[PDB]
Symmetry: D2
Subunit: 26 residues, 4 copies
């Protein structure tokens, strides 16, 4: 648990959500 882990997880989750939103509409 550190700033780099928090940042990486937050950015991975945001990208996972962009992909999920994209496929949901398609």
């Amino acid at each position: 648990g550190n700033a780099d882990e928090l940042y990486k997880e937050x950015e991975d989750l945001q990208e996972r959500x962009r992909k999920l939103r994209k496929k949901x509409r398609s």
Copy 2:
């Protein structure tokens, strides 16, 4: 209770996470 509602929900959650990242930095 449709795809549009889930889509808006997902965008809202994504932007709440971006706001945490921006505040953290």
Copy 3:
């Protein structure tokens, strides 16, 4: 931006997701 805000947001989002999962199945 601080530890209390991060904690509160993470806990609010988890609870919002418990409610969304609950209503999705129902």
Copy 4:
């Protein structure tokens, strides 16, 4: 591409957030 898949996805995202909170504390 059904409700079961979205349900598992949502549980996965929720548990990933609990893991960040636990690591933070």
